[PDB]
Amino acid sequence: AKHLKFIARTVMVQEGNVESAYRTLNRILTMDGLIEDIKHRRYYEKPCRRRQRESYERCRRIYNMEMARKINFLMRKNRADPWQGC
């Protein structure tokens, strides 16, 4: 309301490529957390339920980031079996 307009969340279209511009805008809102925040704000999330979700989302980040670290660590070993026959 008080801020200047057409500066925040504004993306310029390149060569009339509106699809790519919209995808860029949607990716900016997703990475900053605005999209997921808007969906959670539609109905009131009670504090205990918010704490239960945040705890869930944090444990998933931990597990997922550790699994991914193990996948990248072991990927080199996907090479062909060097002792074929033993």
């Binding site: 801020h3 500066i7 925040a8 969340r9 990716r27 900016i28 809102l29 990475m31 605005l34």
Partner: protein
């Protein structure tokens, strides 16, 4: 006895501890150019430490300085001041890909 036995030392090859880009520097709420480097250019959202790369002490200092600068009439809230859009990029985030 023998002279070739291992002796007790502290790891002489130990590398110095890593320091964040703001280690040892004063974070002032008046310094809006610095503070703008840690907010989203599109939404004004403060970046987390996994993006800024700051230590816990400087992440708190930057956060508290931004919240002070914003309400005291020094910094915008909903976007990054366009004047600071060409400052050195120090945050590990890419929007275009």
């Amino acid at each position: 006895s023998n002279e070739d036995l291992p002796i007790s030392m502290e790891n002489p090859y130990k590398e110095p501890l890593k320091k964040c880009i703001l280690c040892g520097k004063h974070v002032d709420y008046k310094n809006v150019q610095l503070l703008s480097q840690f907010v989203s250019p599109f939404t004004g959202c403060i970046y987390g430490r996994h993006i800024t790369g700051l230590c816990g002490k400087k992440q708190k200092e930057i956060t508290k300085a931004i919240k002070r600068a914003q309400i005291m009439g020094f910094m915008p809230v909903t976007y990054k001041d366009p004047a600071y859009l060409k400052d050195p990029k120090v945050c590990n985030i890419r929007y275009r890909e």
